Amino acid sequence: AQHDEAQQNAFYQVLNMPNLNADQRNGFIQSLKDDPSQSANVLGEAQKLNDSQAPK
C-alpha cells in the first residue's frame, strides 16, 4: 500500500492458491518472509506447485 507492490502481490498470490495445502503455502510465505528479494522466485515456485496440483 505504502509501496512494495511486487512484495505484497507475491504474498497475496501465495495465499490465494487453492490447490496448495496449508504446509505448502505457509512454507512459501516463510520463504518469502526470509528472502524478500526472492518474491518472484517464491511466487513462481508456489504457482508451479499450485498448477501441478490442479484438479482439472
SS3 35: coil
How far apart, in whole angstroms, are the C-alpha atoms of residue 2 and residue 13?
18
- C-alpha grid cell, residue 22: 496449508
How far apart, in whole angstroms, are the C-alpha atoms of residue 6 and residue 19?
22
Domain ranges of the chain: 1-56
How far apart, in whole angstroms, are the C-alpha atoms of residue 21 and residue 40?
20
Name the nearest CA neighbour of 54 among 19, 13, 18: 19
Asked how this structure was determined, the answer is NMR
* CATH superfamily label, 1-56: Immunoglobulin FC, subunit C (1.20.5.420)
How far apart, in whole angstroms, are the C-alpha atoms of residue 11 and residue 45?
13
- C-alpha grid cell, residue 37: 528479494
Residues 6+ apart with CB under 8 A from 41: 35
